[PDB]
């Protein structure tokens, strides 16, 4: 009936197939990416184990190397914060109590983290935390809005890079550092977490004391998984 | 003419806002005024002082301005004003004005009962036939 209705409702007709074809075609990649990575991870921890176990029994040792990513969360509130510890907590995107970020661990970021330590409980993430934090608390920053990740399509949208497609590419550069670690995090909205379920018992002291703040190494995972 | 139903009618706060310390003084009207007192407790929010009006008390904007009957109230001074709300009568209802008469008030009650538009202060006996 409507002259342009067909010139419309036929265009909608093939844009629907374009969606469905460009959807189920993404699972194939999202599937063969995850596969590639899961096998990639067991091919590492099982390499260290064989490699560690050789340095033992011959009287050698094995360096764990140096962790690269570090999860950082802010244990104090906003009050009575000095000028240089504002400007650092802002450049780390931690603007709020119990925000969290993933950052490289290198000399400029190491020396930057120790000036704010009274504010910061940080450490070295598991793979279980990154998955949990990129899935459950993951929010992409799209056009200025903080939007939850309900889908693998929107990730491929924001990042046109096509080394980041599914949520399992997200976790990868987060976990393994790598090339796109910045442009993946920098597009994540900084994590917002609940308080720890059972608690620290003294936010005001360093962890190596009856304290929270500072570098608690891998015990951050155990501490962080209470926030999620 | 059963009204257009909305979602839940919940009000944020029913109790009114009255100005600080009007009960003590008989000339002070219960109407609100914002205290500008520098050491005034109410301005400083002391927990157990009266609460102030905010942007935060809005009425939900879905159920906003709806009387308990389900009808947004439109005033009517004469039998010709019934015709505007003939079509939307599921939404609006009429309110005869105060000064409108025992004689005009006879007319509007008829020509409302015929059209099925609803009057609030219109005689309700024709409805409870």
């Amino acid at each position: 009936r409507a002259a342009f209705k067909q010139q419309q409702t036929e265009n909608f007709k093939k844009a629907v197939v374009a969606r469905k074809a460009a959807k189920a075609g993404l699972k194939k990649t999202a599937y063969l990416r995850a596969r590639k990575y899961s096998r990639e991870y067991r091919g590492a921890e099982k390499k260290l184990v064989t490699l560690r176990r050789q340095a033992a029994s011959h009287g050698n040792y094995y360096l764990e190397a140096k962790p690269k990513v570090a999860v950082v969360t802010r244990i104090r509130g906003i009050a009575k914060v000095n000028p240089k510890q504002r400007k650092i907590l802002q450049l780390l995107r931690l603007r709020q109590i119990f925000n969290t970020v993933f950052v490289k661990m290198n000399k400029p970021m190491e020396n930057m983290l120790r000036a704010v330590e009274p504010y910061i409980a940080y450490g070295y993430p598991s793979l279980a935390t990154v998955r949990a934090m990129v899935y459950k608390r993951g929010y992409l920053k799209i056009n200025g809005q903080r939007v939850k990740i309900t889908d693998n399509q929107m990730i491929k949208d924001k990042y046109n890079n096509a080394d980041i497609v599914c949520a399992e590419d997200m976790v990868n550069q987060i976990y393994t550092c790598g090339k796109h670690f910045r442009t993946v995090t920098h597009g994540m909205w900084p994590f917002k977490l609940a308080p720890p379920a059972g608690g620290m018992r003294q936010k005001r002291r360093h962890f190596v004391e009856g304290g929270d703040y500072g570098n608690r190494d891998t015990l951050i995972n155990r501490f962080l998984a209470r926030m999620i | 003419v059963k009204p257009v139903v909305t979602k839940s009618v919940v009000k944020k706060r029913t109790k009114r806002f009255t100005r600080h310390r009007y009960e003590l003084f008989p000339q002070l009207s219960s109407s609100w005024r914002k205290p500008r007192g520098e050491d005034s407790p109410v301005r400083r929010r002391y927990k157990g002082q009266k609460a102030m009006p905010n942007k935060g008390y809005g009425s939900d904007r879905a159920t906003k301005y709806i009387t308990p009957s389900g009808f947004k109230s439109f005033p009517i001074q004469n039998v010709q004003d019934l015709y505007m709300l003939v079509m939307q009568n599921r939404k609006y209802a009429g309110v005869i004005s105060h000064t409108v008469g025992a004689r005009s008030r006879k007319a509007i009650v008829r020509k409302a009962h015929e059209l099925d538009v609803r009057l609030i202060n219109g005689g309700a006996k024709l409805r409870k036939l």
Binding site: - | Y65, F74, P75, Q80, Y83, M84, V86, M87, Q88, E114
Partner: protein, 146 residues
């Protein structure tokens, strides 16, 4: 030549037909279908318009504007009565010939007038049925004139 676009900026906030009461904006225009105050519903203002308006028993008139006799008023508004039992899509399809914008409302209003007339018929019957019992001490009749 004074387009509707330009005239709606003039009459929007002031009018005879505006009638904003208690924060509500209705319209007392006789040519409004549902009575909201908007361009599509301003009959006096638009260059082509239509209305679903009642007549005797259940007949449904339709008044209709048009571009051409736009000035010259007894000639710019033309009414045509549809028969008593008219379908509502019949009346709407008339209005949709002139102004397809109104195809929905004229339908809902066509069915509406049909509801009113058959509502007046039940009421005016029940009022007089029980008006017999009342003994009135006065009544008035305007005497036929030649």
């Amino acid at each position: 030549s004074h387009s509707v676009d330009l005239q709606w900026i003039l009459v929007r906030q002031n009018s005879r037909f505006l009638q904003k009461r208690g924060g509500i904006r209705m319209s007392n225009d006789p040519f409004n279908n549902n009575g909201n105050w908007t361009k599509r519903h301003c009959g006096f203002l638009n260059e082509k318009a239509a209305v679903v308006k009642p007549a005797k028993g259940g007949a449904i008139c339709v008044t209709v504007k048009d571009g051409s006799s736009n000035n010259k008023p007894r000639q710019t508004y033309r009414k045509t009565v549809h028969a008593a039992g008219v379908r509502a899509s019949d009346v709407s399809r008339a209005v949709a010939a002139v102004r397809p914008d109104l195809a929905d409302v004229s339908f809902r209003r066509a069915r509406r007038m049909a509801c009113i007339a058959s509502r007046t018929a039940k009421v005016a019957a029940a009022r007089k049925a029980r008006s017999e019992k009342i003994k009135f001490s006065r009544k008035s009749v305007r005497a036929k004139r030649h």
